[PDB]
């Protein structure tokens, strides 16, 4: 099944909300995993990721959803049980699910056979590759992870790509674009939206894997560009891919530019590197003195207002992690220790909502939220959560939500 947590930012309450059965989501027997809780046009947009299927799932009715029997496993040894069909069977297509609202009823479930399923992959994460323009649009995107997988029936033939959904609209329109063309040979490891019809890709180097390696480039894409056919220019102004570690995994985005964390390899300190769309061109700004960047946002109260970089600090025996103001992403440096700091846990992932509060979402291990005071100054909520894991993560109205599939147990 599916858990849905909610998180109110006004009432700082936590809700669960009934388990939404996962087996046969799609018309095939497989379960599915959200991927992207996407606010537009006063509904909630998300991927189900198809799973593949379960003992339930293959067991059914004299093997009713089975297609590929010799992929049952036979045994137990990301492990799985006996009975368990891994990954989905079904990899030369892409779902999109669409509610009117928090309470997660009646979906519209939607297919194109254009893409691959839309999400991106790392080890046991799933990123979210399904995004809106500003007015509307929305663009459904698909790396094809499927590539990569062992039994060639589950590979999809289906090349990295993306489809569009207009505002307002329950089905796909006629928009095509293949991005491994457009990008010259590349899939992405995940994408962003940045401002108007652009979004940030971050290419591949090398061939997609499960671990993530040679995601050291950055390229821009327009939906609308050479004629509603799409549009790519590769970004300057970046270290060069060997020298890149990794990148933020959510960056901000203002005044039409996005502004992203980037860790060199190694002194060599992080810095937040802002990237215009339009000069598809990217400077180094902020330097943070740390470890790492884990967010990127701000946080404002009445008449004061910052932007606030969270930065990991990892030593020889400990890690730990700090909340810094500052006035300006494009010049300067952060450091731990000048006072403007707010020592916090390590979390899971960070969400700011909108100016006001930022989620430090952290399960098994208790979730957080922090604001700014009338002062200035960064300051905890009260309330704290205990949340179960989660896939994937999202803010629809007042309320942040996470989601993640869970199995049905007796003891």
């Known amino acids: 099944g599916i858990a849905i947590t909610y998180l109110h930012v006004t009432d700082q309450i936590m809700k669960n909300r009934d388990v ?7 018309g095939n027997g497989e379960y599915v995993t959200f991927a992207g809780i996407l606010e537009a046009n006063n ?59 928090e309470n997660f009823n009646n979906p519209t479930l939607i297919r194109t056979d254009k893409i691959s399923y839309a999400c991106g992959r790392m080890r046991s994460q799933y990123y979210q590759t399904i995004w809106a323009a500003d007015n509307g649009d929305v663009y459904v995107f698909s790396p094809s992870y499927a590539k990569i997988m062992d039994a060639d029936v589950q590979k999809t033939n289906l090349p990295a790509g993306v489809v569009r959904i207009k505002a307002g609209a329950t089905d796909f329109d006629s928009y095509y674009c293949n991005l491994e063309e457009l990008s010259g040979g590349k899939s992405f490891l995940r994408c962003w939206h940045i401002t108007g019809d652009y979004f940030l890709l971050q290419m591949y180097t090398g061939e997609i894997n499960s671990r993530g390696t040679g995601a050291t480039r950055m390229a821009v894409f327009k939906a609308t560009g050479n004629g509603d056919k799409g549009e790519l220019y590769y970004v300057d102004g970046l270290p060069e891919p060997d020298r890149i570690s990794s990148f933020s995994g959510t960056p901000f985005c203002e005044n039409g530019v996005a502004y992203v964390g980037v860790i060199p390899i190694t002194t060599n300190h992080p810095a937040i590197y802002k990237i215009d769309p339009v000069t598809h061109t990217a400077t180094k700004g902020l330097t943070v003195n ?60 960070w969400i700011f909502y909108k100016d006001q509060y930022l989620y430090r979402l952290q399960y098994n291990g208790v979730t957080t939220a922090y604001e700014l005071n009338t002062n200035g100054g960064i300051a905890k909520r009260s309330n704290e959560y205990t949340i179960t894991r989660f896939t994937t993560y999202g803010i629809f109205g007042e309320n942040i939500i996470s989601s993640s599939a869970v199995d049905a147990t007796f003891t």
């Open 290 to 349: 740390a470890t790492g960047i884990t967010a990127i946002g701000r946080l404002a109260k009445d008449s004061h207002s910052t932007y606030v970089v969270s930065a990991t600090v990892t030593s020889a025996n400990s890690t730990a992690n700090y909340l810094l103001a500052t006035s300006t992403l494009e010049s300067g440096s952060v450091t731990p220790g000048n006072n403007n700091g707010f020592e916090t846990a390590t979390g899971t992932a």
């Open 20 to 26: 939404i059965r996962g087996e046969n989501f799609l």
């Open 43 to 101: 509904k909630i947009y998300t991927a189900p990721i198809p799973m593949g299927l379960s003992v339930y799932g293959s067991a059914f009715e004299d093997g009713k959803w089975v297609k590929y029997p010799e992929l049952v496993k036979t045994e137990d040894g990301s492990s799985y049980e006996k009975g368990e069909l891994q990954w989905t069977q079904y990899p030369n297509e892409a779902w999109v699910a669409i509610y009117n609202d």
